[PDB]
Symmetry: C3
Subunit: 269 residues, 3 copies
């Protein structure tokens, strides 16, 4: 179980994450209304939400997404798109571990995700901090699905500690690094990480533990099925590094489960 308020946040950032896949949301002019197609983000559309920055083909690995101003919810939202292009998929395959001593000693992260974040960190840090300067009353949130959730998690780990909190909501994110990094992500302050998984989605099981990867705690596991509406009683908070019994179970994984986080995600043209 989670609270109705936390459930509402989970649903809203799932929709911001879904919105990052719509092509028109990666080259939109600054100041325009954020919209999706196919009912992919009705709660985002209802809000007074506009683009501060929209990006595609950025850095290395085709970093894509947008930075949104949400005057209804008083948010600054950095939403990273997950995998769509060949370049995205090739980045995901760069799965050796690379030192990220500039985030934490002993920490190592996925080479592809960390290389992609490093290549855009200066630009996106500046954009976020400009938005905070203009709307210091607002809350900074980073979000994404799948690869986008990995990028949001690395970006939050890197950019926290500069005065403003950064909350991260990830949906179906892969593991992003080793046990040291998983522990760092569990205990870091200056914001909260909400790592959301769905049933037996394969993606949070990748890369496998045998390659030196671990998951941060906690996990918010959606137990309701694919195409089934989610309620607050279908989400289980699971504590512990590499905790079993949520998504990390020794059963058959599933691909369609990756595409259903409150609604369809990754499918907006």
């Amino acid at each position: 179980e989670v609270s109705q308020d936390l459930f509402n946040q989970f649903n809203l950032f799932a929709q911001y994450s879904a919105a990052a896949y719509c092509g028109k949301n990666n080259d939109a002019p600054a100041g325009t209304n954020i919209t999706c197609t196919g009912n992919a983000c009705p709660e985002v559309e209802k809000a007074d939400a506009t683009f501060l920055y929209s990006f595609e083909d950025s850095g290395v690995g085709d970093v894509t997404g947008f930075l949104a101003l949400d005057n209804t919810n008083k948010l600054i939202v950095l939403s990273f798109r997950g995998s769509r292009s060949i370049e995205n998929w090739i980045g995901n395959l760069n799965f050796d571990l690379k030192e990220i001593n500039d985030i934490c000693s002993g920490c190592r992260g996925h080479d592809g995700f960390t290389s992609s974040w490093r290549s855009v960190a200066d630009t996106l840090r500046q954009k976020v901090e400009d938005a905070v300067r203009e709307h210091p009353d607002y809350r900074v949130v980073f979000t994404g699905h799948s690869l986008g959730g990995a990028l949001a998690t690395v970006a939050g780990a890197d950019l926290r500690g500069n005065g403003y909190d950064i909350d991260v909501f990830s949906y179906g994110a892969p593991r992003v690094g080793n046990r040291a990094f998983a522990e760092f992500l569990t205990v870091q302050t200056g914001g909260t990480l909400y790592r959301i998984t769905h049933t037996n989605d394969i993606v949070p099981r990748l890369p496998p533990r045998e390659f030196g990867y671990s998951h941060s705690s906690p996990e918010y596991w959606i137990k309701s099925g694919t195409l089934v509406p989610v309620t607050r009683n279908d989400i289980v908070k699971i504590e512990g590094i590499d905790a079993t019994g949520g998504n990390n179970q020794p059963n058959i994984p599933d691909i369609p489960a990756h595409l259903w986080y409150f609604g369809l995600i990754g499918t907006c043209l």
Copy 2:
């Protein structure tokens, strides 16, 4: 076993379906001859068959294929390409069910397939009906492999009942809708659906039954192996909605089997 005449039709429309994947057959000038590369479609090439309308990047979901006039066999052939582009694949993942009451009461179809057809239906209907008017002695046939077979099935269901029959030949097609749609596609008058599957091809097993999908009856199951020439004795007709014992069996599915329907399909560059 099937009759030699039906076998000859199955082989011919497999080649029309293969031809839809050749890029040169999606942006060809009207009136030019239909050809493939290699031995992808020798029986189409032997016929006096020309393009009426060759299309790509159309509607939503990258609808691609051609409308052909076959003066040898006296056919008007609408052949849809299956999945090749990223956009095709994004459409395939829009696997929620959407109402299609304008086709049949209570029917629901795959959102991607039905949205794609809807986006091109007016244009393609007009072109088919223009050809029928000029060539009333010619038989109208819709065909395709995989996604293309799904589009041909939806299009046939929609455009039947306007004074001329439409036969549909699909090769390795996924399920396209709910039980009501499967029943409608089983009993609809004004043409026959020939739904052809091969051994343990995975695609006719998708989306899974659990998501609310069913298959129309009957099924023409090819039992001969991959790269094995098909004879009329290798094809078995299987009756019953969601029948088992043909392609819909609880065994390990296969990917190369999806590409061998009389010959290679999906591989023409």
Copy 3:
């Protein structure tokens, strides 16, 4: 175990193969240095290795790679990229056997790989032979990973016999033809083929034997794991057409194993 000298060659051509995947190495000015990103090819970077020719989306099937002049090792290296684009993948799926009598009597090869090579053979032969004339004491080596190793193997078989040796180093290459072709690749004069495999990489098990495919002899099998450094003691030479007990065993195959040949290969953006 292999000799330290052969190990050094195996490691170097693995890095030349990895370098062919970097986009910047497929369209670079002649005479400029070959480099990669993030330790994908440090031994190539250390050498005086410069572009003689670079190519992308050549011929049919998106033939991509480069021709290098290596003054440190006295090499002329033709490195073919493996699979990245959709077009590459479609070519891989063209897995029927096609006659290659003009390469060797009785030989049949994978339709995709042989069609791709035929479409670039004249141009690349001219580039290789121009380089030979300019540096007649350098050693001609063709190399590649996965599809790129298949192309290097077919190209070497075709272009040998014209007055200079051609050695081939392939990494995780699929089978490329029938038993006659496998025998020819085992016995052909005018160069040596070093066919390198890793643990239970699936790709050297494709297409399956049952489709009419065989492997040339010998095989150099890397027994160390994925993400594990290779030493010369971890490589075993296995002789015999279609020999078992190296990569060709009846156990479960693995995908990540395909990406680790001395280091990560196929992942350079």
